[PDB]
């Protein structure tokens, strides 16, 4: 959407239509300083748990990383605002 | 298409009404091509009384006029008002259909209500067309959106971070970081930031990318708004600021290097605050950084970004990701101490990669080695990482003295 | 455009099961605990609920050593032991939350009465050192 | 009752007119306070008290060349 959020960018552009890869290495026991957590001398009809972002949990957002600007493997498209209503703190 | 006849199994049934026990199949074929031949000769001669006596209906008095024509005896009882009823009999293996005729008391036909008397044939004249079209006599056929307050706030805050002056930018970032009610404007800010980082590919502006990364860093410091629902948009924008190769307009003089370590610190914060075992944010970020680093053909800028993010994640990550590929430093020093082309742009990026690598691997060498470190540099690759490790041990001793 | 209202990845029979197992594993009645512990020890479908169990354990010990509530801790350590011997579920994705919880049971000071339950405290350190090795 | 059968659940919906009025009111008040403090900090400012910019900043009054155009004309139509 040309007139939506990011209209400023669209106007500036002037477009007007409208073995180290082994799974264990990445397990967070081998990548997290969990020692810091140890506490020493410290001093359901509706969901009980919260619902996670399905796009973060499931989608391949990694496909929106632009590795090479000139050699971009696919063609990206303008993104429309989707106003997810799962999030609270949004009136609608 | 083909000559259609009565079925041959319909003549075995008829032959058992007669009393003939066994009739062979060549006799049944001999019967059914004759009786279906005589049906077609009375089907087509009944049609000659349907056409010459103009009827287009083929009443049962047409067949009786044709059986009279072929000399065969008439079929009695087919002029009464009847229809086609059939009654199925299932049985214990014998499937058939019959009539199921009914009875009626004789005095209820003597005392039936008589139908009305018929009328005699008379003539009637009427105009069908009068010099043209037909007359109309009855003997003829008939013929979600932001309120203006927050729209103005969104406009002023986004245009304050495009680069007219620095003081309005600092007040806009201190607004974003410290306001309580900026929800309902978080999706607009996420869209603005992600599309603005995308617009770097058309115009390789380092400055506007630094401004958008300071916008993300200000969005993270807000205590009131929760970026959990919108982090899937801000993660690849910061990732694009890390591992893309042309971050500059003039590659040689622009310090894309700082937008590298700033965005690497940003993504370490974004996967410290938000990584949950349902999310798998940190493991999926380490996997992208790792397969971008281990894979050859990658430019020195994107390798710098990969090493910078991996080294800002923490100590155990550089233990189990960076330290196996320390021999890659030799492949780097292949193109530094001895390059056929010196005046290219690979040398500044290579020794930037080298400086970052030995700066981050000096405390890792200080953690997992002896305290002496006499010829660890010689044992290390190129003998320089080891000098940096000795310097790091000296710095740690100085920090202990300060404590 | 509004994105569709998402559903939690647990069923309401699974979410009710999680609520019953966690309210039985806080040890109000001993037979309830023991079944819930055997249910944790041999439910084949207890994967895809395991993040919520690991988070309930981890979060519990850390706000349960603020006041040294020994039973709350002895029940959670038995829940950890019942989570470990289940053969179906894949645990080493969640062990980064499990291990600092047990280290805290073994290496921590006791905010409640120092003597008397120290006998159990030794067992709290006995059960924790067993599951640690 | 959980081995073999599954039905989905949803998040708790807040359809209450009182808390929706409170949420919309407080969000409008907070965004207009943030907007006016940002515009008073990045421009010329006045003050009811001596040297008072942090608490109650006023956007300074600027004269218009044609004031009836900004007074009488409607902005939302």
Curated annotation (Swiss-Prot), chain A:
Subcellular location field: Nucleus
PTMs per UniProt: Phosphorylated by casein kinase II in vitro.
Involvement in disorder: Dystonia 3, torsion, X-linked: An X-linked dystonia-parkinsonism disorder. Dystonia is defined by the presence of sustained involuntary muscle contractions, often leading to abnormal postures. DYT3 is characterized by severe progressive torsion dystonia followed by parkinsonism. It has a well-defined pathology of extensive neuronal loss and mosaic gliosis in the striatum (caudate nucleus and putamen) which appears to resemble that in Huntington disease. Intellectual developmental disorder, X-linked, syndromic 33: A syndrome characterized by intellectual deficit, delayed psychomotor development, delayed speech and language, and characteristic facial features.
Domain writeup: The Bromo domain mediates interaction with histones that have acetylated lysine residues at specific positions. The second domain also recognizes and binds histones that are butyrylated and crotonylated.
Family per similarity comment: Belongs to the TAF1 family.
Protein name: Transcription initiation factor TFIID subunit 1
Upper lineage: Eukaryota, Metazoa, Chordata, Craniata, Vertebrata
Curated annotation (Swiss-Prot), chain B:
Full-sequence range covered: 9 to 473 of 677
Main location: nucleus
Modified-residue entries (Phosphothreonine), positions: 112, 178
Family according to the record: Belongs to the TAF6 family.
Transmembrane helix is among the record's keywords: no
GO cellular component, one term: protein-containing complex
GO biological-process terms attached to the record: apoptotic process; DNA-templated transcription initiation; mRNA transcription by RNA polymerase II; negative regulation of cell cycle; negative regulation of cell population proliferation; positive regulation of apoptotic process; positive regulation of DNA-templated transcription; positive regulation of intrinsic apoptotic signaling pathway
Keywords carried by this UniProt record: Apoptosis, Disease variant, Intellectual disability, Isopeptide bond, Methylation, Nucleus, Phosphoprotein, Transcription, Transcription regulation, Ubl conjugation
Assembly and binders: Component of the TFIID basal transcription factor complex, composed of TATA-box-binding protein TBP, and a number of TBP-associated factors (TAFs), including TAF1, TAF2, TAF3, TAF4, TAF5, TAF6, TAF7, TAF8, TAF9, TAF10, TAF11, TAF12 and TAF13. Interacts directly with TBP, TAF1/TAFII250, TAF9/TAFII31 and TAF12/TAFII20. The TAF6/TAFII70-TAF9/TAFII31 heterodimer forms an octamer complex with the TAF4B/TFII105-TAF12/TFIID20 heterodimer.
Modified residues (Phosphoserine): 194
Subcellular location: Nucleus
Record's protein name: Transcription initiation factor TFIID subunit 6
Phosphotyrosine, modified sites: 183
GO MF entry, a single one: transcription coactivator activity
Swiss-Prot record, chain C:
Coiled-coil intervals: none
Modified residues (Phosphotyrosine): 47
Residues found modified as Phosphoserine: 58
Locations listed in the record: Nucleus
Residues modified to Phosphothreonine: 42
Highest taxon of source: Eukaryota
Cited function: The TFIID basal transcription factor complex plays a major role in the initiation of RNA polymerase II (Pol II)-dependent transcription. TFIID recognizes and binds promoters with or without a TATA box via its subunit TBP, a TATA-box-binding protein, and promotes assembly of the pre-initiation complex (PIC). The TFIID complex consists of TBP and TBP-associated factors (TAFs), including TAF1, TAF2, TAF3, TAF4, TAF5, TAF6, TAF7, TAF8, TAF9, TAF10, TAF11, TAF12 and TAF13. The TFIID complex structure can be divided into 3 modules TFIID-A, TFIID-B, and TFIID-C.
Family the UniProt entry places it in: Belongs to the TAF6 family.
Subunit structure of this chain's protein: Component of the TFIID basal transcription factor complex, composed of TATA-box-binding protein TBP, and a number of TBP-associated factors (TAFs), including TAF1, TAF2, TAF3, TAF4, TAF5, TAF6, TAF7, TAF8, TAF9, TAF10, TAF11, TAF12 and TAF13. Interacts directly with TBP, TAF1/TAFII250, TAF9/TAFII31 and TAF12/TAFII20. The TAF6/TAFII70-TAF9/TAFII31 heterodimer forms an octamer complex with the TAF4B/TFII105-TAF12/TFIID20 heterodimer.
Name of protein: Transcription initiation factor TFIID subunit 6
Species per Swiss-Prot/TrEMBL record: Homo sapiens
Gene this protein is translated from: TAF6
Curated annotation (Swiss-Prot), chain D:
Compartments, record wording: Nucleus; Cytoplasm
Transmembrane segments: none
UniProt induction comment: Induced with triglyceride accumulation.
Misc. comment: 'Taube nuss' means 'empty nut' in German.
Quaternary data: Component of the TFIID basal transcription factor complex, composed of TATA-box-binding protein TBP, and a number of TBP-associated factors (TAFs), including TAF1, TAF2, TAF3, TAF4, TAF5, TAF6, TAF7, TAF8, TAF9, TAF10, TAF11, TAF12 and TAF13. Interacts with TBP, TAF1, TAF6, TAF10, TAF11 and TAF13. Component also of a small TAF complex (SMAT) containing TAF8, TAF10 and SUPT7L. Forms a heterodimer with TAF10. Interaction with TAF10 is mediated mainly via its histone fold domain while interaction with SUPT7L is via its C-terminal region.
Disease tied to this entry: Neurodevelopmental disorder with severe motor impairment, absent language, cerebral hypomyelination, and brain atrophy: An autosomal recessive disorder with onset soon after birth or in early infancy. Affected individuals do not show developmental progress, are unable to sit or walk, do not acquire speech, have poor visual fixation, and show poor overall growth associated with feeding problems. Additional variable features include seizures, spasticity, and joint contractures. Brain imaging shows hypomyelination, thin corpus callosum, and cerebral and cerebellar atrophy.
Family indicated by similarity: Belongs to the TAF8 family.
